[PDB]
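Repro case for the chain-ordering regression, as requested:
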Amino acid sequence: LRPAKIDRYVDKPAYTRREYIRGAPGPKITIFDMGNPAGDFEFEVSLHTAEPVQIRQNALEAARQQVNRYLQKNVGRSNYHFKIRVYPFQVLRENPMYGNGMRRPFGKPIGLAARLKKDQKILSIRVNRQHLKFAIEGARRAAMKFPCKCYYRIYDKEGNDVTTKILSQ
Amino acid sequence: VQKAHSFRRKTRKKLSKHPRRRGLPPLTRFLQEFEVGQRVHIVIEPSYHKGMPDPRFHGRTGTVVGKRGEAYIVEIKDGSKVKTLFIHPVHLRPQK
Amino acid sequence: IPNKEQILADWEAHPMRRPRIEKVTINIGVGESGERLTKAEIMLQQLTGQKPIRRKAKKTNRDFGIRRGEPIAVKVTLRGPKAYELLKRLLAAVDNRLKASSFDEHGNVCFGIEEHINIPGVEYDPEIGIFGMDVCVTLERPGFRVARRKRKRAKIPTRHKLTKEEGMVYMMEEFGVEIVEG
Amino acid sequence: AHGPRYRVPFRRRREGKTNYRKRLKLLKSGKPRLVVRKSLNHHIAQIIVYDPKGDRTLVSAHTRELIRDFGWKGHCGNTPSAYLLGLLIGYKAKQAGIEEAILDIGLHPPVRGSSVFAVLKGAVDAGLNVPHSPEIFPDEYRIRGEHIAEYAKMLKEQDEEKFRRQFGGYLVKGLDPEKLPEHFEEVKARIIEKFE
RNA sequence: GGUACGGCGGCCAUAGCGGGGGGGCCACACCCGGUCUCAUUUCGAACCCGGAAGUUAAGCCCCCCAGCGAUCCCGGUUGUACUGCCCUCCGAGAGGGGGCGGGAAGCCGGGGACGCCGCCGGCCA
RNA sequence: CUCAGGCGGGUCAGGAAUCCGCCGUAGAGUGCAAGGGCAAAAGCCGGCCUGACUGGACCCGUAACAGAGGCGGGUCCAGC
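-- result from build under test --
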């Protein structure tokens, strides 16, 4: 597996038309909703990206697995809702290189990634007051697996930012 | 790979029509008249396939300098060359 | 029919709202081209008076042994006093009861006849087995020509469109009875 | 319409009154149009010219003016009435100064011997130069109106109540269905003498 | 000059779809019958020929709505997103920023909108 | 004359034979790739026909601007 810095940046154009892309791989991440989606939770911790970034499906799956394990261990399946709000659409290609070099260098698909915009939410963990610390820790652990700087905010049901208010008292 | 220019080369959107404008256009544009020296814009009607100028000259403004049959003779200046075209009135619009 | 008397009152108040038979169509699904098809043709000609229409096969289906362009079924359509008399004859030949689960959303009746009655004739010179038909009678109101004429064609509103209960009421008043299919 | 991409037809097309494909072909001539239109109880004939902002009618004729003026007590939705109206509109056009026109039968089909072609024949007899071919005209006996008299005689020979049902209006009006050819000839002579 | 009358058009949904009430001087229709004209790849269903016993039930005409569709105005998001020219402005990089000039889309709230308009004719006056 | 698909109803007949009513902006179809255009049609079904012709002009494209043998297309005059 090549370094993620090769695909971290969004200079290249969007490459997501499976009708014309030949051999595009299938997704490696298949679960995006976990916990109790229909539960009534007071607070929502959302993780935002600081820069326009491409997050590989491998990183998304790793963050999903670790955060879900931590939440199951420390919260309870019926006390949280962990959701990943972005699906990988961009197709990551690579130069398929006795042995020519840079001749016909158009790349073949090798993976998938999700492209995001500045200050865009990546994932959201809905929890009650008690489990806010665990939600924050899970968000931090997820952020530690991404190729860019990320921050987290706490919103109430309406959508007002109350992160400082809550974390202070 | 180099591609030569043809009549419909790269005209997916230029020669397309608004979805609500599908069908025959009103007959005023078809039956309009012009006078020598009048200046007219070249706006192609994709539905009518007769008397259509090359799409490369779509959107320009030319000078009427005569008439042949039901087509108007329109002169344009491409760079420094004078080009004469025979355009059906349905593909024309008066200036102002 | 809880609204039977209301429908009758509406009909008598407004004669132009009285439903009438539009057309009665007899169809024979012979499923084959040959002497059996010709037998169906001649039997329908004798039954009605006017010549039938041969229907071709749409697409192909080797399961049914059909080929595109091959005539398959036979159709005939009747209107007017002839339709009235012939419909009475077929409804008498079949048992005089129509099942409730046969009127469509627009008060049209579609049933089937498998036995021959009402001056049928038991001639078996042709295939003979070609007997058996589906009868479809359509209902309308007098002002339905608007949706069918070419010039100044318009649409019929739900106020003038027919319905199941009205079709059943008209059928009962004209002739016949309804059964609850068990 | 139930979506942004829905294409609502022109108002006249929705009303089912105009055939724009034929209208364009008619207008490509750039000549006055002799428009003939039919109704259950009347006929309409007009002569129209094109304006890029709206058609203008020069001379118009109707059948309601045949009952008055000249005097025509027959049914105004038949071939003799159509012929008389054609004569009237043709003479009116000649008076107005238009001598040639192009027939416009709207959405009506081009069926031989129809009242529209009877109107065309009447206009031609009046003197208007409307292009045509003689094979499309109705027969002379039908133009005169014999077939109606023959049908009335057949009804009289058959059950009389059916004849009264068929020609009830003529009885109350005061005209026997027979001799209608004579009535039509009198009306035609009146019109010709008036306009000549 | 009137008319809840018709024919031929213009822009071609702000005009469409769906609903509610009202009308039959004339006119438009439904509709009665198929000898003659015309027709069914059967059917006078359509088209065509001949009329008025009935009806305004509905096409049509007059008035009304904001459920869907469309679309005009104003306010908020917002001078936000984006962008033309210059830069010895910042940023490791990605990229951003300052000066002058342009400026959305979508969404939310309040109004508009169930079409205007032209030539001629019928009937009455 | 109007399609694809769907809904309700019909003897054999069922998922699919052949029909009947309604909804249906084309979600069908075009001789063929894709794009565009076509619904009282350019699609479907029918009638007649051969202009898929002869003698010639001017113009656009290949080849913007900016030169061209050959080729393709457009607007016309005359004949039959």
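Ordering looks correct now. Residues 10, 13-18, 22-23, 25, 48, 50-54, 75-80, 82-83, 141-150, 152-160 of chain C lie near RNA strand E (CB under 10 Å from a C1').
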